[PDB]
Each structure stands twice: as structure tokens, then as C-alpha cells.
Amino acid sequence: PRYLKGWLEDVVQLSLRRPSVHASRQRPIISLNERILEFNKRNITAIIAYYLRKSPERDPIEYAKYMEPYAVGLSIKTEEKYFDGSYEMLRKIASSVSIPILMNDFIVKESQIDDAYNLGADTVLLFVEILTERELESLLEYARGYGMEPLILINDENDLDIALRIGARFITIYSMNFETGEINKENQRKLISMIPSNVVKVPLLDFFEPNEIEELRKLGVNAFMISSSLMRNPEKIKELIEGSL
Structure with a gap:
């Protein structure tokens, strides 16, 4: 991993011993x-x-x-x-539903990608800010060796520069304060606009105004990864994907 401080250093060193x-x-x-x-x-x-x-x-x-x-x-x-979280939680979910499962973790060694494959996950999240550029490329290739196109978490311009240099094709945009979890919606749209056409782009949204969805659609986002809003009110996903009778 790259040099880290704070809780990010703690999860990463914990993950190395996973x-x-x-x-x-x-x-x-x-x-x-x-x-x-x-x-x-x-x-x-x-x-x-x-x-x-x-x-x-x-x-x-x-x-x-x-x-x-x-x-x-x-x-x-x-x-x-x-x-x-737990690996057994992931295994039970993967064998209970039929839609793709992304293993979201702090992936810092190949055996974690081995785990995701063995447990039934369909892809993994790679996190630019915790890895060196060479590490991220190596884990990206290893994930691809299993047939997984990993989702690359970028948080700023530097993260994106690294992701594009190593040939990322599936990118999620957080633009998040990793100490508080707050998402800068303005810097998120800005990073999305800098991503080339051949990359599948997925902004992360905790809470959102429905107006912000249509604006992100205009920027050409392929999907939305939505966290706290759906945790609080899971039925809100129906309004996003279908009309009513």
C-alpha cells in the first residue's frame, strides 16, 4: 500500500492480515x-x-x-x-440472488481477490488512494485474470490520472471526505466530465435530489451506486428504475 495515516492506515494494515x-x-x-x-x-x-x-x-x-x-x-x-462485514455474509448473498455482486473492501493483496472469486463475487472494488500506481495496475490485471473488471474508486484528479494511466475501464467517483463520509457533489460532476468516453462511470450518492440524477444523466454516467438513501428507504429504488401505475 502507499503511505497512509488515520483509520485508512488501520483498515489497510488489518486487511493485509485478512x-x-x-x-x-x-x-x-x-x-x-x-x-x-x-x-x-x-x-x-x-x-x-x-x-x-x-x-x-x-x-x-x-x-x-x-x-x-x-x-x-x-x-x-x-x-x-x-x-x-464478513466473507460469509458475501457468500450467502452471492448464492441467494442472481444479480451481479461487487465485493467492496480495502483490497491490498491478491488473496483478497482470490476470496471474492471463491465466495461468488462477480467483481471487486480497487481503491486508488490506498495503493501505489504499480500496485493498482498489478491488482487490476490480477482481477482481470479471473474475468473480473474491477470498479476503480477515484476521489480526485490525481486518482483519475493514475486510473487512466493503468487502463481502468470501470470507475466509480466518490469525491468523499474519508473522515466524515460527506460527498462533494460539485467536484464529483467535475471528475465525471474528465473521464473519457470508453470508461463506464458510476457516481456514488448517499443522498440525492431527483434533480441531481437527471443532471448526472446529462454527463453520461452509466450507473448510480446509491448508499444511505436506499438503506433508509429501500423502496425509493422503484422510483428510479420504473414508472408507477
Whole structure:
């Protein structure tokens, strides 16, 4: 990992000691970025439901089964200490729903990508701010070796410069204060506009005005990863993806 301080250094050093699981994958890779592109072809709004067991609360299996008919995919956060995630939580979800599952964690070694594949996840999140440029490229290639196109978390211009240099094709835009969780919506749109046409772009939204969705659509975002709004009111995803009777 790169030099880090604060809780980011703590999760990263914790993640380096994450033991690998001895599970065997029981279903194929269901590509997340390809399903998003299939949604785009049919102009279906693609929403990744971003799930946390806790945050510094919904049942993980019930939340996943509720989102299955609506979400383009699920983001499951498997970090244990700060987010109450677990690998067994991911395995149960992956074998219970039929939509793509993204393992969201602080991935700092190859065995974590081995775990995601073995547990049934369809892709992983790679986090630019915790990795060196060479590390991120190596983990990107390793994830691709499994058939996974990882989602690259960028938070500022420097992160994007690194992501594009190593050939990222699937990028999520946080623009988040990692100490508070607050998202700068203005800097988020700005980074989105700097991303070339051949990259699948996914802004992260905790809360949002429905007007902000249409504005992001104008910038050419392929999907939306939505966290706290859907945790508080899961039924709000229906308004995003379908009309009413």
C-alpha cells in the first residue's frame, strides 16, 4: 500500500492480515459492467445498491433479496472492523440472488481477490488512494485474470490520472471526505466530465435530489451506486428504475 495515516492506515494494515477463505465458486461470473451496458442499451436506469452492515441497519440477506428485481447489481462491504462485514455474509448473498455482486473492501493483496472469486463475487472494488500506481495496475490485471473488471474508486484528479494511466475501464467517483463520509457533489460532476468516453462511470450518492440524477444523466454516467438513501428507504429504488401505475 502507499503511505497512509488515520483509520485508512488501520483498515489497510488489518486487511493485509485478512486470512484467505477455502471456498469453491458455485456459479459463473455475472459481469457487472456488462449488465450495466445492457441496461444502457435498453435505457433502463442502472442502480447499484450499496450495502453496509454498519457504518462508523438492514439484514444483509433481506436487503439483497429485496434489491434483486430492481438493482443492476449489489455492492457488499466485506470489511469487518469498521463496517461489520464478513466473507460469509458475501457468500450467502452471492448464492441467494442472481444479480451481479461487487465485493467492496480495502483490497491490498491478491488473496483478497482470490476470496471474492471463491465466495461468488462477480467483481471487486480497487481503491486508488490506498495503493501505489504499480500496485493498482498489478491488482487490476490480477482481477482481470479471473474475468473480473474491477470498479476503480477515484476521489480526485490525481486518482483519475493514475486510473487512466493503468487502463481502468470501470470507475466509480466518490469525491468523499474519508473522515466524515460527506460527498462533494460539485467536484464529483467535475471528475465525471474528465473521464473519457470508453470508461463506464458510476457516481456514488448517499443522498440525492431527483434533480441531481437527471443532471448526472446529462454527463453520461452509466450507473448510480446509491448508499444511505436506499438503506433508509429501500423502496425509493422503484422510483428510479420504473414508472408507477
